[PDB]
Amino acid sequence: QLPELIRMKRDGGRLSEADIRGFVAAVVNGSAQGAQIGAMLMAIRLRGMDLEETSVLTQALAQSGQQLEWPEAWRQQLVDKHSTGGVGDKVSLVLAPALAACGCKVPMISGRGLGHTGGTLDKLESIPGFNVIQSPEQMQVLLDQAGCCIVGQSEQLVPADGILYAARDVTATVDSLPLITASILSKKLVEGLSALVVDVKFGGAAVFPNQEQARELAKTLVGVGASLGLRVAAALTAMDKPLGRCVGHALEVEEALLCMDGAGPPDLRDLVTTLGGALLWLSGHAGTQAQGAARVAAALDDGSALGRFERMLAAQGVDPGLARALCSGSPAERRQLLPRAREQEELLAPADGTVELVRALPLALVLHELGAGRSRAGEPLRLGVGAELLVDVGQRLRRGTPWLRVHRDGPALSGPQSRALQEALVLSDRAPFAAPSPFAELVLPP
Amino acid sequence: QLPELIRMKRDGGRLSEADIRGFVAAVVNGSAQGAQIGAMLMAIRLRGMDLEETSVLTQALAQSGQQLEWPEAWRQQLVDKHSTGGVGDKVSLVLAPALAACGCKVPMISGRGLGHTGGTLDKLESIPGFNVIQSPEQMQVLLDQAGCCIVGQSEQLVPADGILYAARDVTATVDSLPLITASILSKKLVEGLSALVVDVKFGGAAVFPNQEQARELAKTLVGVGASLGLRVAAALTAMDKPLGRCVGHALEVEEALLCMDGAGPPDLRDLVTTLGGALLWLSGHAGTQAQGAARVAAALDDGSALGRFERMLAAQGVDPGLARALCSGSPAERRQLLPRAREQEELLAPADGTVELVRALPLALVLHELGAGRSRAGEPLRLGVGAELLVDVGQRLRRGTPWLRVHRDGPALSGPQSRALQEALVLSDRAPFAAPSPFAELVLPP
Ligand SMILES: O=c1[nH]cc(I)c(=O)[nH]1
Ligand SMILES: O=c1[nH]cc(I)c(=O)[nH]1
C-alpha cells in the first residue's frame, strides 16, 4: 500500500518494479491522495533512485496511457526535441514548425511551467483558442496537415506524468534526476520517434545550475533513452541569461513569431538552428550539423516554418483568421492580438558600462511572483505578464537608459522585487563584445 | 509561497515563525494542496526541525483553532493524559473516566489511528452513536455532567493538527520527533490544563522503538511543554508486546470496560493506575504518586470510573439505554452490544515452548490490512476487526494450543498473513515466568 511504498523510499530503499508500477497505477486511477503523491515525490527528491528504478518509472509513466501509432510512411520522419526548461526558452515554438517544413513529423508532447521555468504549453495558451489537449487521432490529423503539433499530457497521453508534473512544479520536487528523466523520456517514448534531441540547460536559471549535474542528467537521459530503444542526443546549453529578449508567455509567442519570419535575436535563432541541425543529423535527414542547421535556418527565412506554425494553430483550435493574422501580422499587430499586461514598467541602467550579463534566475523569480508561474497546481497564470530585455549582452549602455521593461497586472514593483531585477543587470566597463551562443556541447548515446 | 517554504525545509533550512504560521494558515484555509502538505511533511520527516521551529509549530497548530475557555472554578482540576500510540493501548479509555472519578476535569482531545497504531477516537467509534466532534460549548456541558470527554480535532479545535495528523498517518511521516511534539502539545495546550502526562512508547511497535529516541521525545514533550507554560510529565512504557489481550477497536472497548469492572489484564490496569497516579500528583490533587495510583485504582472498582464512562458515552451521543447496557452488561453481553467481526480464525502454537513474547508490530500490521488501519485519508475502518491474545507472555504451551484469535470480516487469513502472525509468537526454551510491567520510567518538567 501507498504508505509502505513511501516509507521504503523515505528510508532510502529502492522500489521494485511492482512497487513503482503500483504507485503509478494508484496515481492514475486516483486512489493515491495528494499528500501521498507529495510525500513520495519528496522522498524520491531527497533519497533518489538508481537507473533501474528510474527506467521503471519511465516505462510506467509511458504506459500509464496510450502508445502513439503512425503511418509507417512516417517512421523515419518522426522527430522531436525537448528542453529541460529555462527562461525565455521558446525554442520549441520555433523548431516544431521549422522541422515540419523540412518534411519532418513532430508529435510534440511538452508540458506547462515547472518551478521558475516556463512551459511551452502555457505559452501557446496565450493564443486564443489554442487547445493543448488533443487525442491521438487528432494528433495524427495534425501531423498530416501541418505535420506539427504541440500537445500536453492527458488521459490518453502519459496521464501519470501529467499528474506528477503538476505536483512537482509546486512541491519543490522538480530538480530530481530520476523524475526529470522518467518525465521527459516517457513523453517522447510514447511518440514513436526516430530521433530526439533533449536540450539540457545548465547555468543560473537551469533546473540544475551546476554544469556537472547538467551533464549527469544529459548522460542519463541519453543512456536510459537508449536502453529503452530511443535514438537520443542531449545538448548542454547555457541558461545563465534568458534566451532571446522576451520572457513570459504572450511575449515569447511574438518573439517566436519574430524568429519565424527571419528576424529575432541571434541567440534564439542560433539555438534553434543548432538543435534542429543536430536533430536533422541524428535522424539522418541532414548529412552534417552545418547542413541541418542551414536547412532549418532556411526554413526560418523561407517562411515555411511560420506557415507550418500557422496550420498547427488552426488545427489545434485557433480560429484560422487569428492564425493568419499572428503569422501575417507585424510585431505590433501580434502584440495586440495576444494577451497584454496592464502596466509597463521600464528599468533604467544604474551606470555607464557593458551589459556583461542579465541574470535569468532573478528575472524569472520576479516574473514568477507577478503571475507568470504557479505556486499552486491548477493555478491560472497571468498571461501577458513578462519582460523585455531592451539591451543585449555585449552592448554598452549609459545610466538612465532603459534595459528592461516589466509587463505587469498588479502594483508597481515591490521594493525587494526591484532590487532583485537591478541585481540581475550585471555591468562591467569594457569595450562592447559579441555575446556567446547558448549551445555548449552535444552528449551522444554510448 | 508554499513551493519555496518546502524547498527551504527540503534543503535543510529552518522555517521562520512567519513561515510556519504561513504554512499552517495555508493548511487550515485550503491554499495548501494535498501534494504540498505531503511534500512539507516528508521534507520535515527527513531534514528535521529545531526546538524553536517545533515550539513555533506547536503554537501555530494550537492557535489554528480555538482556545478552550473553562469556568475559573475548574482551572486547577483540568487535567489530561496522552499516548504516543501503540497496540492495544486502550489506556485513555480506562484512565479518562477513572480520573473523572476523582473530581478531575478531563477535556481529552485525542485522535484516530496513526500509522500502525490504533487511535482512541476510532475505538470510541465502534460504540454505536458515539460522536467524536464536539464543539467547545458541548465540551463544557460534557465536563459539567460527566467530568470527562474524548473528542477529536475539528474546524474549531486544532484544525491544522487534524489535517497534518490524517496526512502523516498515510505518508510515513508519523515518526518525526518535531511533528509528534507539536501535534500532541498543540491539542493539550488548547485544553487549558494544569498538568499533562504523556505516555511515550518505546519498543517493537512504538513510533520510536529505540528507547533512547523515545526519551528524546519524552524530553522534548516536557521541555517544549514547559516552555509553553504547561506542566508536563512524560512516562516511557514498553510496546514490544500488546497492551492487554485485545487488539482492535470494538474489542479494545470490551477489555477496557472489563478493566473498569475491576478486572482485566495486569498490563492495562497497571499502566492506568501508574500514569493516573503521576497525573494526580503532577496537578497537585495528590501528595505523592502512589496515593494517586491508589485513588485511580480505587475508582476502577469504587467511586466508579465505569460510572463516569457511562455518562460520557451518553453525553457524547450514545443512546442512554445502550450506555447503561454496556456498563451493567457482562463481557458476553458487551460483545453482543458492539460490532463483531464477521468470522473468527484461530492460530495454533507452531510448537512446544514458553511464550517469551507476542510481537505487537507484526500483529498491528496484519490487523491493519484486514481493515483495522487506514491507507488513505478518512478511509473507513472495519471496527469489529481485531485480535484476541489467547495466550499470555511467560506461559508454556504445546503444538496445537490456539494462541491467537483473529476477528476478520473478509477472506480467511492468507499465507503471508499467517506466517507473519506466527513469527509474532516467540517461544523460548526457558521456564515459565511472570510478564513484566509496561512502565519503565518517568521524566519530569524541572
Ligand atoms: O517534460 C519535462 N520537461 C522538463 C522537465 I525539468 C521535466 O521534468 N519534464
Ligand atoms: O496526538 C498525537 N498522538 C500520537 C502521536 I505519535 C502524534 O503525533 N500525535
Same domain, A354 and A300: no
Q: Which residues contact B106 (CB under 8 A, 6 or more apart)?
A: B78, B79, B80, B96, B99, B100, B143, B147, B148, B149
How is the beta sheet containing B246-248 ordered, strand by strand? B246-248, B386-389, B402-408, B343-348
Q: Atom 2 (ligand 2): residue with closest C-alpha? A: B184
C-alpha distances in Å from residue A177, one per residue of A231, A331, B10: 20, 39, 16
Buried b (16+ CB within 10 A) or exposed e, A239-262: bbbbbbbbbbbbbbbbbbbbbbbe
C-alpha distances in Å from residue A50, one per residue of A176, A177, A180: 12, 10, 13
Which of B17, B50, B66 lies at the terminal end of a domain, its last residue?
Answer: B66
Same domain, B292 and B160: yes
CATH number where B313 lies = 3.40.1030.10
CATH number where B371 lies = 3.90.1170.30
| Distance from C-alpha of B14 to C-alpha of B4, rounded to nearest angstrom | 12
Same domain, A317 and A366: no
Measured N-to-C along each axis, helices A289-302 and A304-315 cross at an angle, to the nearest 10 degrees, of 70
Residue A24 contacts B where some CB pair is shorter than 8 Å: no
| Distance from C-alpha of A287 to C-alpha of A299, rounded to nearest angstrom | 17
Angle at A44 between CA A41 and CA A49, to 5 degrees: 140
B186 is written with which cell numbers? 498543540
C-alpha distances in Å from residue A233, one per residue of A10, A79, A236, A377, B254: 33, 12, 10, 31, 67
Selection from A358, A423, A346 nearest residue A392 by Cα = A358
Same domain, B82 and B114: yes
What pairs with residue A79 in β-bridges?
A195
| Distance from C-alpha of B351 to C-alpha of B196, rounded to nearest angstrom | 45
| Distance from C-alpha of A206 to C-alpha of A212, rounded to nearest angstrom | 12
Nearest CA in chain B to A170: B3
**CA A145, chain centre distance (Å):** 24
What's the N-to-C CA distance of chain B in angstroms?
A: 40
- DSSP string covering B59-116: HHHHTTSPPPP--TTTTTTB-EEEE---SS--HHHHHHHHHGGGT-BEEEE----BTT
- Give how many domains chain B has, as a whole number: 3
The reply to whether residue B42 touches residue A37, judged by beta carbons under 8 angstroms, is no
Buried b (16+ CB within 10 A) or exposed e, B355-388: bbbbbbbbbbbbbbbbbbbbbbeeeebbbbbbbb
B21 is written with which cell numbers? 504560521
Selection from B17, B174, B2 nearest residue B85 by Cα = B174
C-alpha distances in Å from residue B193, one per residue of B72, B108, B136, B160, B174: 12, 10, 15, 20, 25
H/E stretch holding B426: strand B425-428
C-alpha distances in Å from residue B376, one per residue of A30, A244, A369, A426, B171: 11, 47, 33, 51, 9
Breaks (C-N over 2.5 A) in chain A follow: none
Selection from A411, A373, A409, A401 nearest residue A119 by Cα = A373
Same domain, A391 and A438: no
DSSP state letter for A262: T
| Distance from C-alpha of B89 to C-alpha of B12, rounded to nearest angstrom | 35
Which of A66, A81, A106 lies at the terminal end of a domain, its last residue?
Answer: A66
- DSSP string covering A195-214: EEEEEEEESTTSSS-SHHHH
Same domain, A428 and A442: no
B392 burial level (CB within 10 Å; 0-12, 13-18, 19+): middle
Which of B10, B38, B66 lies at the terminal end of a domain, its last residue?
Answer: B66
User: Alpha-carbon torsion B439, B440, B441, B442, what sign?
Assistant: negative
Selection from A16, A106, A26 nearest residue A64 by Cα = A26
Same domain, A203 and A312: yes
Selection from A101, A119, A338, A331 nearest residue A207 by Cα = A119
| Distance from C-alpha of A171 to C-alpha of B238, rounded to nearest angstrom | 38
The reply to whether residue A10 touches residue B172, judged by beta carbons under 8 angstroms, is yes
Angle at B380 between CA B63 and CA B345, to 5 degrees: 130
Within 8 A of B176 by CB-CB distance, chain A residues are: none
**Distance from Cα B421 to the centre of ligand 2, integer Å:** 26
CATH number where A7 lies = 1.20.970.10
| Diameter of chain A measured on Cα atoms | 64
| A39, A46, A171 ranked by CB distance to B3: nearest | A171
The reply to whether residue B167 touches residue A35, judged by beta carbons under 8 angstroms, is yes
SS3 B354: strand
User: Alpha-carbon torsion A265, A268, A272, A273, what sign?
Assistant: positive
Is residue A10 a known part of a binding site? no
Nearest CA in chain A to B7: A172
The answer to whether A276 touches A256, Cβ cutoff 8 Å, is: no
Same domain, B229 and B149: yes
**Distance from Cα A346 to the centre of ligand 1, integer Å:** 32
Nearest ligand 1 atom to the CA of A115 is 6
B182 is written with which cell numbers? 507539536
Residue A98 contacts B where some CB pair is shorter than 8 Å: no
- Resolution of this PDB entry, in A? 2.5
Amino acid at site A444: L
| Distance from C-alpha of B133 to C-alpha of B150, rounded to nearest angstrom | 9
Q: Where are the beta strands (DSSP E) in A259-409?
A: 343-348, 353-358, 386-389, 396-397, 402-408
Selection from A120, A98, A115 nearest residue A248 by Cα = A120
Measured N-to-C along each axis, helices A250-260 and A320-328 cross at an angle, to the nearest 10 degrees, of 60
Phi, psi of A195 (to 5 degrees): -140, 160
Q: Is B183 a catalytic residue?
A: yes
The reply to whether residue A35 touches residue B43, judged by beta carbons under 8 angstroms, is no
| Distance from C-alpha of A41 to C-alpha of A48, rounded to nearest angstrom | 10
Bridge-based pairing of strands B386-389 and B439-443 is unpaired
| Diameter of chain B measured on Cα atoms | 63
A444 is written with which cell numbers? 551522444
What pairs with residue A354 in β-bridges?
A396, A428
| Distance from C-alpha of A413 to C-alpha of A370, rounded to nearest angstrom | 9
| Distance from C-alpha of A178 to C-alpha of A196, rounded to nearest angstrom | 19
Residue A393 contacts B where some CB pair is shorter than 8 Å: no
Amino acid at site A192: G
The answer to whether B429 touches B396, Cβ cutoff 8 Å, is: no
DSSP state letter for B370: I
Same domain, B274 and B376: no
The answer to whether A422 touches A351, Cβ cutoff 8 Å, is: no
Experimental technique, in short, is X-ray
Bridge-based pairing of strands A353-358 and A396-397 is antiparallel
The answer to whether A348 touches A388, Cβ cutoff 8 Å, is: no
Buried b (16+ CB within 10 A) or exposed e, B123-162: bbbbbeebebebebebbbebbeebbbbbbbbbebbbbbbb
| Distance from C-alpha of A230 to C-alpha of A226, rounded to nearest angstrom | 5
Same domain, B329 and B197: yes
Amino acid at site A330: S
| Distance from C-alpha of B194 to C-alpha of B282, rounded to nearest angstrom | 9
The answer to whether A223 touches A108, Cβ cutoff 8 Å, is: no
SS3 A45: helix
Does the Cβ of A111 fall within 6 Å of ligand 1? yes
Residue A207 contacts B where some CB pair is shorter than 8 Å: no
Same domain, B104 and B197: yes
Residue A171 contacts B where some CB pair is shorter than 8 Å: yes
Cβ atoms within 10 A of the Cβ of B440, count?
A: 17
Give the CA count within 13 Å in the CB-facing half-sphere of B180: 29
The answer to whether B228 touches B192, Cβ cutoff 8 Å, is: no
Selection from B124, B130, B95, B22 nearest residue B280 by Cα = B95
Same domain, B251 and B352: no
Amino acid at site A289: Q
Nearest CA in chain B to A374: B3
Catalytic member of A45, A188, A368, A396: A188
What is the C-alpha R_g of chain B?
21
**Residues found in chain B:** 446
CA distance A45 to chain B (A): 9
Q: In terms of residue numbers, what domain contains A53?
A: 1-66
